[model samples]
Target: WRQQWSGPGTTKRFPETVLARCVKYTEIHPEMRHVDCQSVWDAFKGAFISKHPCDITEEDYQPLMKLGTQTVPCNKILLWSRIKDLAHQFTQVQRDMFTLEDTLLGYLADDLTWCGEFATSKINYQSCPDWRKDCSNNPVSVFWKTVSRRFAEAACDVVHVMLDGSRSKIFDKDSTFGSVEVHNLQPEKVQTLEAWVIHGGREDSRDLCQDPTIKELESIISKRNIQFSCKNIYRPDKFLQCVKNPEDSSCT
Candidate 1:
C-alpha cells in the first residue's frame, strides 16, 4: 500500500508506474522485448471491468498474471511471511537477493487499486473496494498469489523463507507464503528450501528451533520431493534487522 499517487482526477487513471517499470523490464531483459506494457495493462485492467469489486473472489482466475517471460536466474528469492519491512530492508541491503516485489510485474502491480466503471469501462478509482478483513477475496490477493506461484516455480537451487519466531506458527495456511508460494514450488525445479526463524535469543522460544508449523513445512516439501531445513537467527543480521526488531537496538 503506497500513498503517493494521482491525487484526484488521475485516481481514475491507472498508475503509470505499471507501464514505465514494465517497459524498463523489457529493455533490461531482451528476451522479454516482445512483451508490450500496454497489453499487460489491458489484461490487468480487464479483471475489474463491469464487475463489482467485492465479487472478485478468485482474482487468480484471470490469465493476466502468467505474463512473465524471463525465468528466475537462480534461487535467490527472499520470501517473508509477516515480515515485509525487514524483508524489504534485507533485499535493499543485500542486492543479490530478489523478491517478487523487486521484479517488474510485482513492482508495477503492488499498492495499486483501480477498476472499471460499470459497463462504461471508465477507470473506477474511487469505487475500488477495500480488501476484506480476511484478505483472501480480492483482486490484489489473487494477483500476488499467482505471481508468487510463478516466482516459486521459476526458482532453482535453494529457496529461502524468513519467518518471525514471534508467531506460534511459522506457516499460516491462508497467507501468501502458506497458501500460494509454497504450493507452486516445483520439486524438480527447486532443490531445497530453508526457513530462517528470527528470534531474540530467548531460551524458551519454541519457534526458534522446531515447531508444528515447521514440521508441517517439512512434510509439505518432503511430500513434493523437496528437501527442507530450519535455522534460528538471534539478533540483527543485516541493515533490515533494525526495522524488523526496532526496539532491539542492542544489535544495531
Candidate 2:
C-alpha cells in the first residue's frame, strides 16, 4: 500500500522526501499555509537524529507535534485500528471527514521511516529497529503514539472510529487507536463516539457490533459519558472492498 513506506532504498533522500510531502500537503490543504514546513522538518529531524533508534521516546517528538498541531473540525475526526487502507479510503471518498493521517503532522510522518545512530549525529538509514518486535520506544512507534494522541485531543463533537471485524479481537489494547487515541479523547469536547465495525468483503467475517469485543469498546466510551453507537457495516466502505473482489458473492 502507498500509505506504507517500506523497502531500504525508498527513503534515501529523507529530508527531501519529507519536505516535498509537507509542501504538497499544504498545497492540497491550502488553509495550512501558516505551517512552515521547514520548522516542522527541523523539529522532526532534531527529535531522533542523535539518539539510538530504540532509545527515542514519545516526549522527544513534542516540539514537532506542537508545531504541526491544527484545529480539527467538530465531528470530522476519524480514528481506526487495523483497517488503515479502508480508513483512508473512507476519508478520501467522504471528504467531509478527516483521519489522523489527513492532518499536517500525521501526513508528514505517515508512511516514512527514519532512525538515528548513537555514535554520529545523523540518520542511520541502513536499518532501524522494528517498532513492535525490537522495541516499543523506537522512533516510529513513538511518533505514531504522540501524533495519534494529539489527533484525539483535538477532536470535538462526534468522534468516528473504523475497526476491523475480521479479527477475533477487534479492540486490541495494544493498538494505537485503542491505547492512545481512545484514551486521549476528551469527554468534554466529544459528545458521542461512533464505532464502525467494518468487515471485509467475504462470507467468513467473524465479529460485528454485537460481538463482545465491540461491546467492550462501547462500554469504555460509555463510561466516559460519551453517547456510543455502532454500525455493523457501512455499505459505502463495503463497496470499496468489493471492488478488489468484483466477483465475490458479497459484492452483490
Candidate 3:
C-alpha cells in the first residue's frame, strides 16, 4: 500500500485489516485514515526530524562511495556486502533455493527432457536414453532426482524466509517513502516505495528462475514422461489454468 503525507503531523496509516474493515475505517476517518497517526508521526519525527542513521540511503551514500573509491574494487562491494548480510540473516534456504535453481538448469541442459520437440522418443531417445532403463540407475536420472529433491527442500525454505522477512520488514519503523519519513512523504515517493517492493519481489523471482540449473531441470522434466505425466495428469486442468494465468497458481 502507498502512504502519503496530508500535512505537518499528518501521518497516513494503513490498517492491518481486511478490505471491509479498511473501508469502514476510511468512511469514519477518510482523510489520513489508512495510517495510525500516532505511530506514523512518531516514526516520522524519529527518522527525518531526529536524523536517524540507519539503512542504506543518500546520507550513507557519500561515505559509502568514498569508502568504495578508496578501499574497494567497486561500489558493488558495499552493495554486495549488504545483500550478503541480508541473505545470511534472512535464511540459508533462500540462498540455497537460488543455487538449486541453477543446479536445475544444469540438469535440464544435460538431460534434454523438457522441450516439446524432444518430448517424444524420436528426439529424446538419443539424448535422455530410455526412461525405464535409466529411471533408477542412470546417471542423468540420479542427478535429476538429487537436484529435484534439493530444489523442493530449498523452495520450502525460500517460502518460509520470504514470508518471515516480509513480516519483519513491515511496520512504521521499517517503513519509509524513499529515504524520507513515511508520515511526511510526497505522493511520488509513496508510489515509488510501493512499486519498489512489488518489483523487487518480481525481480527476485526472475533471478531464481533464470538460474541455469532451473532451466536445465525444466528442460529435462519437459521431455521425461514420468515428470510430464505427473505434472499434466495429476493436475491437467490446473496446469491449463496456470498457462492461462500463471500468477494465479504456484505452478510457476
Candidate 4:
C-alpha cells in the first residue's frame, strides 16, 4: 500500500515489500534486534515527553493500550514514502471509479431521454421527465454513496496498517518490529511514553491537520450523510486536534 518516492532523502528508500519483511523479522528476534528499533522509538518518545510532560489524561491513555510493546526505529523518509504510495493508489482508484460512473451516467442520459418538440413536455418540450428524474435520483446518489463508503473503508485500512499489529507493507517485516506494546506500565508512564513516540516530531504535520481546509472538507462530507454508520465518527474538531497535536494516542 506504500509508494516509492525518489526525492532528496529518498535515494535510499526501500521497497515496501522489503521494509515490510524487515519489520516482521526484527519483531521476532532476540533482545539485540531491538537496538535500532528502540533507538528510533526512543527518539520519538523523548521529543514528545519533553513537550507534553504531565498533560495526558485518561482519554489520551486509552489508545496506547492497543500498541503492544514491539518498537521499531522511526524513519520519516521510509514512512512518508509508504504513505505517498498509498495516497497515489487511493487517488488513482477514486479517479477511475469517477470516470466509470460518469461514462455510465452519460450513456443512460443519452439513451433514455428525448430532446425534440414532438414530446409532451413538462420540464421541456422533448424531455422524458420521469426518466430524467429517475436518472438523477439513482446514478448520482449511488455513485456518491459508493465513493463515500470507499473513502471511509480506505481510511480504516490505513489505520489498520499503521496502528494495528500487522506487518507493514512498506517496511521489511523480517527486519523491523511490528507494533509496540505498553505492558505493566503505570498510567502516567503510558501517557508519557505514547506522547513521546507518536507526537514527538513533525510539527508541520500537526499544523497541517489543524488547517481550516480540513474543516471545510469535513463539513462537505458531513452534509452528504454517507451511508456508512462509522462515517460520522470523524468529527472535524477531534480530527483537527488528532492531526495537529496527537500527543495522546487517542483515536479521533
Candidate 5:
C-alpha cells in the first residue's frame, strides 16, 4: 500500500548514517570491537521494519539493544533529566563519565528517526508518525525507552544524575531518567545516587538540595534502599552558560 502525507521523513541516509556511526564508535572505543556494524544495522532494522509507525513498542527493539549493549563500568553512568545539553557537556568534559548518548547504540541513533510501512515492508521515507502527536509508542520513542532502561539497568556503584534546578522541580518523574532510569536502577548494585542540581547563571535560583521536590527524589531512592545525596552546583555549569552570554549580570 502507498503511504500518505508529506512531512519531515525519516532521517536522510538512515542506514548509511547509522552504520557509519556504529563503525566509528567501535574504532574510537576499542572495547566495542566485538560489535559488527553490519549486524547492528540488521538488528536495528528488524525492530520496526514492516510495522505500523505508531504501533512500535519498546520491546520491539530488544534485538538491536542486545547487540549494541556494552559495559558502562561502575560509577561512570551519568543520568540526566531536562538538561540534555549540560549533561552531554559534563560527559564531554569528564571523560570518565558516560551518558546514554555516549554508548554505542545511543551514539548511533542519537538524533536519527526511522519508521516503516505495513504492507510494503519498506521504510517510510516520505513521512513518519510524530512522537508527540501521532502516538507515544512511535518507533523512535520506543527505541529510546528501551535504550534508556537498558542503560539504567547497567549502572553500578555510584550513579550521578544531573537535574535542571531552574525548573520548579529538580526531579521530573515523567522524564526518562525519572521513569525508566531511576526505576530500573538495582539498589544493591548502586551505592549512591548523587544529584547535581544545576541552575542557569544569574537567576534567583532556589532549588537547593533540600527542596521539597529533591526530598521527594531522595525518598524514592531511599525506599529502594540506595543512598542518596544532592548538590547545588554553580561554578562549571554557570561558567559554561556564561560563555554564550558573558554580558549577563552574573558574569560580572
Candidate 6:
C-alpha cells in the first residue's frame, strides 16, 4: 500500500477530536450558533477520505467552508507572510486585527498535512510528499489556497498586509500572500491593499509600493481592479513593541 500514516503514531482520520475545538470556537458564538461540528467533519471526510489527496481541488473544500460565515472587521484585517509571529502577536495585544489563520478552518488545519489514496480510507501521513513535490497535487496547499482565497475575497476597505523589510523580496511574487492571496481580493470588496514593511532599526522599506517587482504586483492588482498602497513600520517604535513600553514614541 502506498498509503500509510507517516508521522502520526497510527491512524490519521483528520483528527476529529483535535479539530472539534475550532468547530466550537467559531461555530457557536453567543449571538449565533447554527454550525454543526459533526456535519462539518462529515463534509471534511467526504473531501479527503478514500480520495487521492493530490487530486483534491479548492472547489472540493467549498461545502465544508460554510463554517467561514463570520465576517472580518472592515479596517482591521491583517495578512502577513514572513512576519506571522509579529502579526499574530499584534492581534493578541490589539484584539481586533484578524488573519485568515484566525478562522476556525484555518486554525484546525494549520501546519498539518494529510492525504488519502483512492479506495484507501486511511490518512497517509508518511508518503504524502511536500506541497510542491508534485506541484499542485497536495492536500495542505489546496486547503490553504482555498481558505486564503476566501479570506482575501471577503476583505473590504483598508485591508492590511505586513511584510518583512529585512527580506529582499518583501512582496515576493511567488509567496502564497504574493501570488494566491493578492489575486483573490475582490476589487469591489477591498478598498486598498495596504502594505506595511516592518524592519529592525533602520527604515529599509523604500518605494515598495512602486518597486519594479511591486509595480508588477501593482499591475496584477490593477488588472484585477483593486487599489494598492504601502507603508513602513519600523520595529522599535511599532505597535507591538510599544505595547511592551507605552511611553515609547514608536506607538504614536
Could you list the CA RMSD of all candidates, in the order they appear?
Answer: 6.4, 5.7, 26.9, 24.9, 4.4, 3.5
Q: Rank the candidates by lDDT, best first.
A: 5, 2, 6, 1, 3, 4
lDDT (Cα, tens digit) per residue for candidate 2, span 26-94: 898888888899998899999998787768887799898888878778678889998889889877776
Which is superior by lDDT, 5 or 6? 5
The prediction achieving the highest TM-score against the true structure is 5
Against the reference, the lDDT scores of all candidates come to 0.69, 0.79, 0.26, 0.25, 0.84, 0.70
Candidate with the greatest lDDT versus the true structure: 5
- Count: clashes, candidate 2: 0
For model 2, the superposed segments whose C-alpha errors exceed 4 Å read: 1-10, 204-207, 234-252
Q: Sorted on TM-score, highest at the top, how do the candidates line up? A: 5, 2, 6, 1, 3, 4
lDDT (C-alpha) at residue 45 in model 5: 93
- Candidate 3, residues 22-59, lDDT tens digits: the string is 24433543442544433432322222222211121233
Error of 3 at 85 (Å): 34
What candidate 1 gets wrong by more than 4 Å, as runs, is 1-13, 23-35, 54-63, 66-68, 131-137, 200-207, 237-252
After superposition, the stretches of candidate 6 with alpha carbons farther than 4 Å from their true spots are 1-17, 27-32, 200-211, 223-225, 236-238, 243-250
How badly does each model clash, as a count of residue pairs? 0, 0, 25, 33, 0, 2
User: What would you estimate as the lDDT of candidate 1?
Assistant: 0.69
Q: What TM-score against the true fold does each predicted structure earn?
A: 0.75, 0.86, 0.18, 0.17, 0.88, 0.82
Estimate candidate 3's alpha-carbon lDDT, on a 0 to 1 scale. 0.26
Model 1, 146-186: lDDT tens digits are 67777777887799988877775767777778878888778
Segments in model 3 whose C-alpha atoms lie over 4 Å from true places? 1-128, 133-135, 156-252
What's model 2's overall lDDT? 0.79
> Tens digit of lDDT per residue, candidate 4, span 123-226?
12121213132232222232232322222222211111111111122222221112111111123211221111112222323323233433432343334332
Model 6 Cα RMSD, 1 decimal:
3.5
lDDT of 6: 0.70
- Evaluated at residue 38, the lDDT of candidate 5 is 97
